Known about the structure:
Chain A: Its EC number is 2.4.2.12. Chain A is α+β, with helices and mostly antiparallel strands and 477 residues long.
Amino acid sequence: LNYSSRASAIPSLLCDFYKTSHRIMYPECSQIIYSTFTPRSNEQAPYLTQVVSFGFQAFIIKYLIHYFNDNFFSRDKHDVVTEYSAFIEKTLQLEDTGEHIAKLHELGYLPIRIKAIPEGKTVAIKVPVMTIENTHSDFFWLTNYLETLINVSLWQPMTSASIAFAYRTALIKFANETCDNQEHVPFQSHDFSMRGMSSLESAETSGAGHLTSFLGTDTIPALSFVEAYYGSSSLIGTSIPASEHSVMSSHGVDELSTFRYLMAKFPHNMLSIVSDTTDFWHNITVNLPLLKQEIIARPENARLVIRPDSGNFFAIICGDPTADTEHERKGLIECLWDIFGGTVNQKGYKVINPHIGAIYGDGVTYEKMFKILEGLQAKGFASSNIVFGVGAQTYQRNTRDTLGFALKATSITINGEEKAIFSQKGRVKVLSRDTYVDGLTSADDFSDDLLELLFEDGKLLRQTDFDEIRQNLLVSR
Amino acid sequence: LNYSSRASAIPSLLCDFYKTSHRIMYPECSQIIYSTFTPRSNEQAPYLTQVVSFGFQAFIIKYLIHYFNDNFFSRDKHDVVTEYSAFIEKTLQLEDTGEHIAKLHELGYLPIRIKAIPEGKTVAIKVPVMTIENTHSDFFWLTNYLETLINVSLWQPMTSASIAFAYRTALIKFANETCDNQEHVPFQSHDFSMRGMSSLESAETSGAGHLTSFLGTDTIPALSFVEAYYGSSSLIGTSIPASEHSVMSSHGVDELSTFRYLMAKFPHNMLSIVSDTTDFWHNITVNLPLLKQEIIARPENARLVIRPDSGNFFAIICGDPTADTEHERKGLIECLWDIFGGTVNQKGYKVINPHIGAIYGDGVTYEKMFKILEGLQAKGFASSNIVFGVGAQTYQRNTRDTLGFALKATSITINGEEKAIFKNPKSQKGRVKVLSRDTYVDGLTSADDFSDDLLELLFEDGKLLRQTDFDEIRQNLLVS
Ligand SMILES: NC(=O)c1cccnc1
Ligand SMILES: NC(=O)c1cccnc1
Ligand SMILES: NC(=O)c1cccnc1
Ligand SMILES: NC(=O)c1cccnc1
């Protein structure tokens, strides 16, 4: 959209250094490189059984169209080539005249053709999600030249999106046993991760990935990102006012006043109050009873949400048999049940008085979330009683090997002959969610391909919005 | 910095959402918020015993100066404020006039004062590396508001630089035991990580951190990133021509031909050839002897470097005693020793013929690198015989909890009184002064001394007050 960052990365050198040397290492009369992008393995995260296609549109627009147009094709040819040549002389000591860079510049666009799975659709592990190839014989080198830029910018949004989807899967499973409806699920995983992401750019694409399965986020720039590259008719994401530790302790030690003060500031909004700044169980067992009348007086769409931020994840929410105190043996959810109202649903699980709520957002991971819900189900509490603030220990603590993303070349054309290069071999076609076929030539029939032409020769050929992406994911279930 | 990328982040909403609700939550007559950025623990990575200060200068310039000048202060004001109000309107159903945003805009600069450890200096775990506060009473909320952007963009460069330092420390330690000199050390950790970083921005700052201790990198944007924000007189980074699997297999299964083809293409440069596309040990035990004559004829400055990319990291390099074949029972390094020349140095370790080299860059981690070097020294091989391609399993496989980074507010001024704020569910209180490398004092007020503070004033009221270049950073780190 209408803002801008100053950049240093040279468009024609947006790669691993060694890719500059590959053009002349290729056989003579090389014409076409065909490559595949694949989530090859989930042994490091077996709960990720579906890979959610997400991020391509943003990547195409930001880098392949805008970054190259703004900083390469728009600039003067002589300056761009002289910079490339000069770099290769200082760093490495060889004469590269950059004549291939100039030829590309004269072309005016990337002779690149990309097919990808529609965003919001999902595929099994080991199924290709993207293919790329060059469309002009002189630029065989360009396909793999772009390998570095492709997955430095795409593996994170898909891993985030696929993690979000797996969370929702677990949350729906629990709602089917403990809850009469699933109205709470779009809000049950709230993105907390921004401050712990490795950079703002990683915060936008990972946050955007979370928004494909959930409405709750604290990463405002992820909202702005989804709006700039995808768009939707309704609100992209939602959030609530919430206190932080500095706010609580700046009000001193009488937290009974601070609770009351903060609740007056947000009379008609949902409001989270971090409650462990001084003495958590004092807040829960002493001040919450004193506030009960004021709590239940607030409108239902303005519930007070209690946020612990310390102690063992399971014991705080579900309780510790190892005692000393019953409040510690019962845990937060049972304590709120004792204090405030509640009902029992058709499925037979306790639902807390909807005037009070609870959020745990302290290093939340998938197995911690799962254990907590298993804990609550065992005590007879509906899974809708807890919200999870999901942070960097979920969305930052990944690598390209979480789902095993690799962009590997699988077919080459030399002197008019196409040969498979060595998983997959040759050109690929995706038949369903969990099956694909390879060993294909460019003459074969791709009519029934799930991979959809996306970008070719500088043009975005097919555009989606975030409403379509989210609908595609509903159907995926 | 003569390029630009298109941006989506709204300057005045560039934060955790709940920070927008915090301004009206603070006590009335709040004036100054003072915060510290501290690496509190290395329990998750005990090999990181020192924190390398790195990344502040670039962050200040890119974001606190350029991004806010380009996208906020230079913009309209009515448009900038209306955008903020409308967002608050959509998302909180609350009516915020955006006056505080307008007051910021009328000010023309961030009323912000920042002290930091000079870049390249080093600090013990648990010592604050940066403090920030507001310089204008109306803008207490601004300190709070910037917490999210500060560590979304600063913990990674410091963690990468701190990892690089720990690597170099280990390599120097081994070079001291096994090697006559340590000229090999600046190239022994080569940055492979770019494709495995989570974004280009993270690749730039992590790669920059790597370049503070090492010259070898494949992350071209990390070089030009260092160029733009720091500058350097000496060489920032270097690399060599090297093949990839797609190059090898497009030539087919006759790799002996391919080797000859590739080394003919780069007769006057060092050249790495990935060697496991079809049959690794066939290339090692058959093709390398057939090429020995051709290899050793190449110039000093143009060695061939063999790149394994599969198998067990230790077994490939150091050998597997349980293995069924003699070449596998010894390592790649002993095999290269048998095939090509070698000498024994003053320290008594074998140094392979410098016409041939070896690089391992397949999921390299600090203990993996360490185990391999124990492997080679146990065999009597100098630690200089191997180069490590260090990838995303080192620089992407981190979180902010690797070094325990936390940005906490420690002092608030309310109605002209400074109060320590803290939680007791590090726990600093008040203003901090770093007395030495490994010690600081914290119960301070703004009236105290602060002479000779290791945290040195860096940015104030829109101005970068103190700037370094990449040479000073490397010099500080050498003396460290
Ligand atoms: N209470 C919150 O909204 C929050 C957001 C991000 C991180 N921690 C807490
Ligand atoms: N209870 C919640 O949905 C929620 C959302 C965001 C932050 N804290 C709590
Ligand atoms: N051999 C190399 O230069 C290299 C660079 C990046 C990743 N893998 C290998
Ligand atoms: N310095 C080296 O040996 C080397 C090997 C591979 C890639 N880059 C550098």
